[PDB]
Design a protein around this nucleic acid. Structure first.
Ligand SMILES: [K+]
Ligand SMILES: [K+]
Ligand SMILES: [K+]
Ligand SMILES: [K+]
Ligand SMILES: [Mg+2]
Ligand SMILES: [Mg+2]
Ligand SMILES: [Mg+2]
Ligand SMILES: [Mg+2]
Ligand SMILES: [Mg+2]
Ligand SMILES: [Mg+2]
Ligand SMILES: [Mg+2]
Ligand SMILES: [Mg+2]
Ligand SMILES: [Mg+2]
Ligand SMILES: [Mg+2]
Ligand SMILES: [Mg+2]
Ligand SMILES: [Mg+2]
Ligand SMILES: [Mg+2]
Ligand SMILES: [Mg+2]
Ligand SMILES: [Mg+2]
Ligand SMILES: [Mg+2]
Ligand SMILES: [Mg+2]
Ligand SMILES: [Mg+2]
Ligand SMILES: [Mg+2]
Ligand SMILES: [Mg+2]
Ligand code: NA
Ligand code: NA
Lengths: 126, 94, 42, 117, 194
RNA sequence: AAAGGUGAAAAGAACCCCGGGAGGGGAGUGAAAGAGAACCUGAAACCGUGGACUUACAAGCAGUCAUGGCACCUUAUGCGUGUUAUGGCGUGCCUAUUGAAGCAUGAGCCGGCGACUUAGACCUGACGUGCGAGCUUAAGUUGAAAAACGGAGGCGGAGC
RNA sequence: GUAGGGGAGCGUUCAGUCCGCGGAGAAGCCAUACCGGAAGGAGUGGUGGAGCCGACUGAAGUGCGGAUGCCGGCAUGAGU
């Protein structure tokens, strides 16, 4: 125990099976649409579905899935034949405001959303 | 009730209005109006034959309740704290 | 001393603040505002 | 010297908001709507303190006349048959007596009839 | 009734102000004193004329969802201040009789506890400072309580430089705030005194 | 116009894993990475994931009171906390008005900014204090880790 | 009990003074079922990584739900 300082230097604090793609030039909502299908299921399956889902968020979501797996296998030494998407989720990043000219003199503002697609894998554990 | 808990009760410590006399174990005699002591139903007046003895347990201070008032369109908003004081009495009588 | 040094108990009274009173609308209702030229002479 | 409003308005606001529990909607999350709810809330609280007594009295009665009726009398007749006799002056709690101890309440009824005709 | 430590011996001179010291009376005084100290300082563009901004803006009626004229007004983030701080004085002249009475009543307050006087400081002997402290240690002046020296003579001051022990006061520039500020008081010279 | 902030000092991440990259996970430096370079704190609106208790014949200013069920016991196992079913009751807020839930005004939400001040020996009154049939200076001078000097003048004192 | 008058106080920043706290950790933020007649105050925990409570007194750029208020951020209309 000690106090709040010692614990800091005695533990570094690791994230088992965690990958994040930050700043992805897509709106969160769509990507949610894509992720939802992987929510809590085999990582194999995961890879397979992303390969056929006709949405384009598919790509980055895929890339992140793989990077997670990569981590669990090299940084966390887990058994890939038991891997699965424990948890996954998309947060909104900063936004790209653009000034889009409309009619009669008025202008608007297009909002270009970004994404922090994160995904975290884990052994099933029966 | 209003004051003084009559009725048939099997040695229970209840909480009612204050009883003036501060302290502890101050014998408190109360008149009865009904009771089932030994499965014997007894109405009022006659019950005067039996009386309840109770000892004071503690002089506790009530639970905190905020008193809020409001009349719309005229302003009038009122907020004041309130807790009504009491005492606990251990019933142990005939 | 300098900390136990009180006031005259009735010398300076708190000033009158008009902001916040849960029912304060200072001045009249109508015809009294940002206008200080009514006067009492004439 | 200047004096920001720092930390003050936050705390006030948080006090208000923390009041909002089972509060649906923005009643529980947007200050203004919260406070605003809290007005009419005042109203209900204060009036209900007075009202709950009416409510309960009604309850007790509703039980008492039932008891009465289980034998062959009513509530009017029954209470009245405790007024004629300074003997019985329970009134309060009587409902509990008609609800838990039937025999006792039977005895009271019989007493009421006996102190009438 | 305070006897001189070094040199003569009197202390029966000087009448004491009645009653036995009055707080409020010193209140009025100190307040006035610190008031004459406050400096005129008010960096604020209260005026809407003082900040940088035009006079016209958007149309009165029409645009809709507006109704403003300049951008320097108090309601605007960036404009002027409504009723802000102006550079002023706040130095009055508290009635003389009352200032005279003040320090009298102050010394009075010190004549019922930590009072100390001294004629001639031949004990000092140049700056040194060290022997000054050594001196104090022979006059109840441990260096635990704050002290104020109000004496003439340069050489004596020169040998008096610290924070918690004592304090230097050139040419009997007495002041209720000063004396009442420190615990003990060291009048020393009998210039203003007697 | 707006725009500040790594750390004590760059030692500011050699090497390895996924990826074109961006990004990230290890490793190491450092007290700290819960300081990682669109790096002090990191509130609120706002978006989302997980969990608990709930909801698919009822008419709901969104509460309030009472009771029951379920869940949790760090101011706290019996006082209550959370949530919820059902019953009773219940015409947003402000403004402006004879009269507002009004189908009258304002307002998307939150944050921050935002409104009875200051000056003139001015006028009048309350209170307080120092003097007292007298009560005080102004400009200024000399001194300033302090203040005293300065009675030209004003108010009392007789009214018509 | 509206306009209105009167009284007693809370809170914030600055200032003087006093008692002090702070790397074993301030302020700030976050939670809470405790206390006070109100404004409010406190204990504990979490976060944080340098400064700051309490008492008394003085001075104010001192308390916001509104002003089609000002600035900024983020929502609804919709994946239309
Ligand atoms: K007032
Ligand atoms: K990289
Ligand atoms: K208002
Ligand atoms: K007077
Ligand atoms: Mg280390
Ligand atoms: Mg108006
Ligand atoms: Mg009118
Ligand atoms: Mg004007
Ligand atoms: Mg005129
Ligand atoms: Mg009644
Ligand atoms: Mg509009
Ligand atoms: Mg400015
Ligand atoms: Mg109404
Ligand atoms: Mg309508
Ligand atoms: Mg309307
Ligand atoms: Mg109109
Ligand atoms: Mg540091
Ligand atoms: Mg203001
Ligand atoms: Mg607003
Ligand atoms: Mg509109
Ligand atoms: Mg806006
Ligand atoms: Mg579509
Ligand atoms: Mg549509
Ligand atoms: Mg369509
Ligand atoms: Na959920
Ligand atoms: Na608090």
């Amino acid at each position: 125990f000690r106090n709040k300082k010692q614990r800091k230097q005695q533990v570094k604090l690791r994230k088992p099976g965690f990958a994040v793609a930050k700043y992805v030039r897509m709106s969160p909502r769509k990507v949610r649409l894509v992720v939802d299908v992987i929510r809590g299921k085999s990582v194999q399956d995961a890879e397979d579905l992303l390969r056929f889902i006709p949405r384009s968020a598919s790509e980055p979501v895929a890339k992140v899935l793989n990077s997670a797996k990569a981590n669990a296998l090299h940084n966390d030494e887990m058994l890939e034949d038991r891997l699965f998407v424990k948890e996954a989720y998309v947060d909104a990043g900063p936004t790209l405001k653009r000034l889009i000219p409309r009619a009669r003199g008025s202008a608007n503002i297009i909002k270009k959303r970004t994404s922090h697609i994160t995904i975290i894998v884990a052994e099933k554990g029966n | 009730i209003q004051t003084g808990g009559k009725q048939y009760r099997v040695s229970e410590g209840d909480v009612i209005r204050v009883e003036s006399l501060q302290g502890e174990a101050g014998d408190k005699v109360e008149l009865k109006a009904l009771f089932v002591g030994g499965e014997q139903t007894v109405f009022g007046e006659d019950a005067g034959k039996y009386t309840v003895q109770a000892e004071v347990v503690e002089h506790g201070r009530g639970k905190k309740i905020y008193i809020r008032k409001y009349k719309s369109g005229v302003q009038y908003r009122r907020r004041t704290g309130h807790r009504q004081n009491f005492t606990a009495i251990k019933i142990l009588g005939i | 001393g300098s900390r136990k040094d009180r006031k005259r108990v009735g010398r300076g009274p708190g000033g009158t603040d008009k902001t916040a009173g849960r029912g304060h609308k200072g001045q009249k209702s109508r015809s009294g505002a940002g206008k200080g030229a009514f006067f009492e002479g004439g | 010297p200047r004096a920001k409003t720092g930390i003050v308005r936050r705390r006030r606001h948080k006090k208000v908001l923390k009041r909002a529990k089972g509060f649906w909607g923005s009643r529980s999350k947007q200050y203004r709507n919260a406070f605003q709810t809290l007005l009419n809330a005042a109203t209900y609280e204060y009036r209900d303190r007075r009202n709950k007594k009416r409510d309960f009295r009604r309850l007790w009665i509703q039980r008492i006349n039932a008891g009465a009726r289980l034998h062959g009398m009513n509530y009017s007749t029954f209470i009245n048959g405790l007024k004629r006799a300074n003997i019985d002056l329970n009134r309060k709690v009587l409902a509990d007596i008609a609800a838990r101890e039937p025999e006792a309440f039977k005895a009271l009824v019989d007493a009421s009839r006996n102190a009438r005709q | 009734a305070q006897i001189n430590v070094i040199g003569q011996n009197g202390g029966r001179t000087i009448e004491l102000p009645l009653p036995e010291v009055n707080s409020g009376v010193l209140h009025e005084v100190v307040t006035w004193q610190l008031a004459s100290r406050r400096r005129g300082t008010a960096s604020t563009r209260t005026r809407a004329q003082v900040s940088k901004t035009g006079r016209k803006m958007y149309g009165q009626k029409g645009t809709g969802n507006a109704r403003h004229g300049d951008r320097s007004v108090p309601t605007f983030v960036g404009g002027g201040v409504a009723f802000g701080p102006k550079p002023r004085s706040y130095d009055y002249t508290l009635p003389r009789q009352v200032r005279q009475l003040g320090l009298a009543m102050a010394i009075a307050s010190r004549q019922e506890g930590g009072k100390l006087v001294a004629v001639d400081g031949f004990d000092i002997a140049d700056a040194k400072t060290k022997n000054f402290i050594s001196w104090a240690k022979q006059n109840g002046l441990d260096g635990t309580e704050k002290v104020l020296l109000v004496t003439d003579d340069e050489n004596t001051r020169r040998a008096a430089r610290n924070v918690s022990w004592v304090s230097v006061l050139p040419v009997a520039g007495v002041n209720v705030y000063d004396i009442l500020r420190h615990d003990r008081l060291v009048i020393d010279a009998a210039a203003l005194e007697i």
